[PDB]
Amino acid sequence: GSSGSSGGTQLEKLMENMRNDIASHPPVEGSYAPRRGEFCIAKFVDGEWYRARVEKVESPAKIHVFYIDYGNREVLPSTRLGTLSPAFSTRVLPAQATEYAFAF
């Protein structure tokens, strides 16, 4: 936590709340099934979870997704994908992704 002259970025706020329950109670690798057109959390090479929308599901090992937080695409397995909580879901914060408008 931060007290005194604090302040962050919209995304940093939501992500900050999720990263917590996500880093303390990480999802089960290979539990959530990514479906074409479904929102979920993806694990970044830096073991950092981020909001993304399944673009194309190839195989349990290959899942085309797009980070709706930055605006990038990465083919990750169904292991790095998990159930995106409604509390941290974009439903509260708008996708800061750049290539989001084109994502879908």
Identify the experimental approach.
NMR
Query: Which residues are within 8 A (CB) of 60 and not within 5 positions of it... i.e. 6 or more apart?
Result: 30, 77, 78
How far apart, in Å, are the Cα atoms of 93 and each of 17, 27, 28, 45, 77? 12, 21, 25, 23, 25
Q: 1-104 — its CATH code?
A: 2.30.30.140
Contact predicate 17/88, CB 8 Å: yes
Beta bridge partners of 62: 59
Domain map (residue ranges) of the chain: 1-104
Strand (E) or helix (H) holding 75: strand 72-76
Handedness of CA 21, 93, 87, 3 (dihedral sign): positive
Q: Between vectors from CA 55 to CA 24 and to CA 91, what angle results, nearest 5°?
A: 55
Name the residue among 91, 93, 100, 72 with its Cα closest to residue 15.
Answer: 93
